[PDB]
Amino acid sequence: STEVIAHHWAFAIFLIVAIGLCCLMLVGGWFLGGRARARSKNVPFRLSAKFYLVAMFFVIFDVEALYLFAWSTSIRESGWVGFVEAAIFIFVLLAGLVYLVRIGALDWTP
């Protein structure tokens, strides 16, 4: 089919021209305009474990999200049995979320 190969060429040209466009604006910004020196121009103008905890929770729940992504595109042909399986999955998810909230894992404020 020539339609799919035309769309592949269009997608490739889209990505190439977008990347080259931002590269070209960066190059033009670097090249144009005069430069001046100052004494204090070069002068610039421990994080808690909650940061790692939030990122880790995001990673784990994103993996369970991928499982639900796979389920959601084929719900009709998985039937009510697949609904029961995904309901068990989501219940385990919500129980984990309730556990995380209730023990203060998702409480930034003291």
Partner: protein, 478 residues
Amino acid sequence: MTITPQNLIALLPLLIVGLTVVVVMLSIAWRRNHFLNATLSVIGLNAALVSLWFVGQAGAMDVTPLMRVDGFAMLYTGLVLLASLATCTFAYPWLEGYNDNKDEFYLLVLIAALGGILLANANHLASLFLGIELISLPLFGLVGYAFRQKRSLEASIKYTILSAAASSFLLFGMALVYAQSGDLSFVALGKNLGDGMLNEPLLLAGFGLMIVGLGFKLSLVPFHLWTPDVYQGAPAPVSTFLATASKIAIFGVVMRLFLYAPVGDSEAIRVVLAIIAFASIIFGNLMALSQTNIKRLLGYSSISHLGYLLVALIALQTGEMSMEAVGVYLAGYLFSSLGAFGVVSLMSSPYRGPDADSLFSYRGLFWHRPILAAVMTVMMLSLAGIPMTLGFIGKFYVLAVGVQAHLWWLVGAVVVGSAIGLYYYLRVAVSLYLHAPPSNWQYSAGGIVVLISALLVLVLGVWPQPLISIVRLAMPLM
């Protein structure tokens, strides 16, 4: 394949342990209650152990392509559940001295027991991989539960790094096997070959990488060096669980994989496993000769005992009673390791800091803890394969299986390793009676567990026929 109500009846201990995980986690979310959450965990494990009766009444059947439930799966599920119940029982008096959160321990033990049940029922490379991971990751948490201690943190780091490496090795081997075979079911691994072309190079290489991962998990030489450090650094109930349940479940799924796969009777794999079993027996016995730490000594002992079990694995296709020998040996090894590690756990309870694992701390144990010393000397006699112990019955089964299949190098290795084991086990058991310079019902429950283990070891050492008949009843699908 779909899931039917009778398949759900065959699913019963897995469903009960999962429901226990959810219930205990929601109870922790309600309120942190050590007694209540420990009680809920042991109630769920006991319920799964009881529901094994309904599983047996249901019969042997395939639940999805992933699992097959039979008497073999029931026996290994029962062994895993017994080890988990003992681990919780030893965990409570140890966790009574823990200043941080104690309720997560039982959650991790329950999830690891779920992985053990999955490995008991596994009929597929997917379920084997998932069961191994489901055992290992809660053990990453449990080994480093007292992560403020440097030994527990170091053991957790070592176990996590090496188990991730072994899991990647096992998954790469599974992928190579799948690339050769085109099916991840156990019975299809080598089925698409004929006319004496079983030794396909990619299939053998994939099975070798799986051997790397599984032999890490079973502490088999040369994937064994983690064992004394992780055994010593872990908390003592965690050491109990890691010595019993993880090893038993992984060896059971290895048993089933080598029974069902047509490439399991390949001569190259048999010779490689013979070399591994020989080296495991000799090395694990030799390294435990001069151990002043009881947990490290039990780690090297575990290496040697898994070598004996692998010797029984090698004669799977040659002889007729290899699976029966493995079942009898694993029951005896579970009871002996439960007693020994439980005495260590009760001597380290409550948690105060460094573990009581020096042999000088167990020197003269009889003069203040006589029952614990009697239990520990019974377990040292059992792990040495001394008669009127179940360990001797297991060793006799291993020797009979090796003699039937004419594995004379392995038989001689078992004899030599038994002599070396005699030296160091007798050293521990007689140091118990030399001269050297609690008060709640959960500690009494742990003492009752180790006493019952000692009584079972002695009684089934004298009279092994009930255990033999039970193991002969628990047979897989041929």
